[PDB]
Amino acid sequence: GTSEKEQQEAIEHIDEVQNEIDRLNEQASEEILKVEQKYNKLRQPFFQKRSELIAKIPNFWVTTFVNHPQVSALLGEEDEEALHYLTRVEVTEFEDIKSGYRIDFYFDENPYFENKVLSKEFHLNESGDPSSKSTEIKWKSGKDLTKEPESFFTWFTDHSDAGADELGEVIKDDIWPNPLQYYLVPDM
Amino acid sequence: GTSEKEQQEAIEHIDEVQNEIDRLNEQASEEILKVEQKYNKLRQPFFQKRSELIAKIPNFWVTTFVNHPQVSALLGEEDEEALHYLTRVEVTEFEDIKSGYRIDFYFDENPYFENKVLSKEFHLNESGDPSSKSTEIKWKSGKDLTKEPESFFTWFTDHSDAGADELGEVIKDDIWPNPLQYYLVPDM
Ligand SMILES: [Ca+2]
Ligand SMILES: [Ca+2]
Ligand SMILES: [Mg+2]
Ligand SMILES: [Mg+2]
């Protein structure tokens, strides 16, 4: 019962209404991002206290990883040995999501590599796509674990799809918020 | 270098710290839910204005669905005919998420069924699991579209996994926020 002029006029009116819904969608997403930023700051003193407490627990992080259903699948026998030198893991999330997040792994002096810290960083590149970069591992002579599944440590050098990279997100979103559940094993 | 007593004491201290992170996680999730509730109220006048404008556009909703990559796969030839009688679609989201959401479909008098409105409701049941329920369709004699893929209209009676029910979530989260993109087809 509407004329074709009335219909086109309604279509334009709907488009204007959609632009207004778009605006609210964006404002909502913005408020939500700020909430996450507020609470990332509120949790940080607690993660820092937890890091000091984990320093009291020998082999905390390798125990956590060996008991994790996804991470354990990536660890070979010699990788597990090397991870006994892992003293500290830190996850840092940047406010600007183009800056992404970083995972740092702190290692005591060990026979495999010279680095005191190994890190993998996740960010958006100039075209808006997920990318990653890492510390170059300075393996010691005859102890390159990357030279039979592939070593865990090839993760540091794997960048051909950060859009994916499940392991980074597992550490950021699962293990980092609560590693204690995986460290602890029921007694009998 | 820590005693086993010091280690157990640290483990308990970590558990306490985790409870404190847990609390912040929950407060963050709560603030985020309230933001979504605020903006659901702010968008509602715009969805209501849009409903009045869509009333001016013949066969708006069937056109939207036939041009939707997932919904079109569910529509048979006779379903499409029946959906030309669909005048109005409404999505209602309740604040308490145990109450879930509802989708209402308004139909002009048609040869297939007597109902003026067909609805599917999604909620959590007492055990916390997704469930759904619907209007009983009062098909007219010899015109039961459920009596060769199955009719679209069997969706109203399909409840054996609301945990899934992709179609409900596609309507709520994709089509409902912006159906105009699917209604509109470029000219040449
Ligand atoms: Ca456990
Ligand atoms: Ca289109
Ligand atoms: Mg034990
Ligand atoms: Mg056109």
Side-chain angles (χ1 to χ4, degrees):
Chain A
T2 44
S3 70
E4 213 92 343
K5 175 190 121 273
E6 281 169 349
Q7 297 180 20
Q8 282 304 158
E9 172 183 359
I11 285 163
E12 314 165 29
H13 287 340
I14 294 176
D15 178 70
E16 295 163 18
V17 167
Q18 289 293 334
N19 287 339
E20 281 318 304
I21 293 153
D22 283 353
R23 183 179 322 308
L24 295 162
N25 289 344
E26 280 185 310
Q27 299 174 177
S29 300
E30 257 296 324
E31 276 200 43
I32 286 157
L33 187 56
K34 290 183 292 96
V35 174
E36 294 290 0
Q37 286 161 354
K38 160 183 171 180
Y39 279 95
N40 276 4
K41 314 290 222 322
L42 291 180
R43 283 178 290 248
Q44 204 88 107
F46 295 104
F47 289 131
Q48 203 233 337
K49 197 205 294 182
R50 190 184 68 184
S51 294
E52 293 160 13
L53 293 166
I54 283 162
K56 303 177 182 166
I57 299 171
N59 303 315
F60 180 89
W61 282 106
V62 67
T63 302
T64 299
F65 288 161
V66 163
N67 294 336
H68 193 275
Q70 293 164 279
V71 178
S72 59
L74 303 174
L75 312 178
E77 190 184 329
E78 197 69 19
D79 293 331
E80 290 188 17
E81 292 214 358
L83 289 168
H84 275 79
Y85 296 91
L86 178 67
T87 60
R88 183 182 171 189
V89 173
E90 298 287 343
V91 175
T92 305
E93 301 174 53
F94 307 107
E95 267 202 317
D96 196 88
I97 308 325
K98 196 140 186 107
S99 311
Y101 68 101
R102 191 179 77 247
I103 306 169
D104 302 313
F105 300 76
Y106 291 80
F107 285 93
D108 275 352
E109 205 147 290
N110 67 88
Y112 304 99
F113 49 83
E114 299 281 13
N115 310 67
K116 311 298 183 180
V117 186
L118 296 181
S119 317
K120 195 170 186 187
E121 193 162 347
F122 304 86
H123 67 278
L124 301 178
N125 61 22
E126 300 285 82
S127 304
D129 294 330
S131 61
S132 52
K133 63 194 191 97
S134 294
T135 300
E136 183 183 15
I137 301 168
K138 300 165 54 204
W139 298 99
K140 297 179 171 187
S141 206
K143 298 304 282 201
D144 185 333
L145 293 178
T146 72
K147 315 289 173 145
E148 178 86 271
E150 293 194 72
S151 176
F152 172 74
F153 288 89
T154 60
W155 178 69
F156 290 98
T157 47
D158 281 348
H159 306 287
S160 53
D161 209 275
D165 206 307
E166 295 179 67
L167 177 53
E169 300 287 348
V170 168
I171 292 169
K172 183 172 68 71
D173 288 351
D174 171 1
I175 300 177
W176 178 247
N178 181 6
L180 185 64
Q181 58 181 316
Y182 303 111
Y183 173 81
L184 287 174
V185 180
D187 301 332
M188 216 191 339
Chain B
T2 44
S3 70
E4 213 92 343
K5 175 190 121 273
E6 281 169 349
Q7 297 180 20
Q8 282 304 158
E9 172 183 359
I11 285 163
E12 314 165 29
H13 287 340
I14 294 176
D15 178 70
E16 295 163 18
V17 167
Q18 289 293 334
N19 287 339
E20 281 318 304
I21 293 153
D22 283 353
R23 183 179 322 308
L24 295 162
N25 289 344
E26 280 185 310
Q27 299 174 177
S29 300
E30 257 296 324
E31 276 200 43
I32 286 157
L33 187 56
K34 290 183 292 96
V35 174
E36 294 290 0
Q37 286 161 354
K38 160 183 171 180
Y39 279 95
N40 276 4
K41 314 290 222 322
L42 291 180
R43 283 178 290 248
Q44 204 88 107
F46 295 104
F47 289 131
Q48 203 233 337
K49 197 205 294 182
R50 190 184 68 184
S51 294
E52 293 160 13
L53 293 166
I54 283 162
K56 303 177 182 166
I57 299 171
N59 303 315
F60 180 89
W61 282 106
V62 67
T63 302
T64 299
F65 288 161
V66 163
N67 294 336
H68 193 275
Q70 293 164 279
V71 178
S72 59
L74 303 174
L75 312 178
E77 190 184 329
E78 197 69 19
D79 293 331
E80 290 188 17
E81 292 214 358
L83 289 168
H84 275 79
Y85 296 91
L86 178 67
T87 60
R88 183 182 171 189
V89 173
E90 298 287 343
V91 175
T92 305
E93 301 174 53
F94 307 107
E95 267 202 317
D96 196 88
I97 308 325
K98 196 140 186 107
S99 311
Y101 68 101
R102 191 179 77 247
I103 306 169
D104 302 313
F105 300 76
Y106 291 80
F107 285 93
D108 275 352
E109 205 147 290
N110 67 88
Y112 304 99
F113 49 83
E114 299 281 13
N115 310 67
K116 311 298 183 180
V117 186
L118 296 181
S119 317
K120 195 170 186 187
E121 193 162 347
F122 304 86
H123 67 278
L124 301 178
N125 61 22
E126 300 285 82
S127 304
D129 294 330
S131 61
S132 52
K133 63 194 191 97
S134 294
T135 300
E136 183 183 15
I137 301 168
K138 300 165 54 204
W139 298 99
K140 297 179 171 187
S141 206
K143 298 304 282 201
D144 185 333
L145 293 178
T146 72
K147 315 289 173 145
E148 178 86 271
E150 293 194 72
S151 176
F152 172 74
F153 288 89
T154 60
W155 178 69
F156 290 98
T157 47
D158 281 348
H159 306 287
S160 53
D161 209 275
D165 206 307
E166 295 179 67
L167 177 53
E169 300 287 348
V170 168
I171 292 169
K172 183 172 68 71
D173 288 351
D174 171 1
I175 300 177
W176 178 247
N178 181 6
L180 185 64
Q181 58 181 316
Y182 303 111
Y183 173 81
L184 287 174
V185 180
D187 301 332
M188 216 191 339

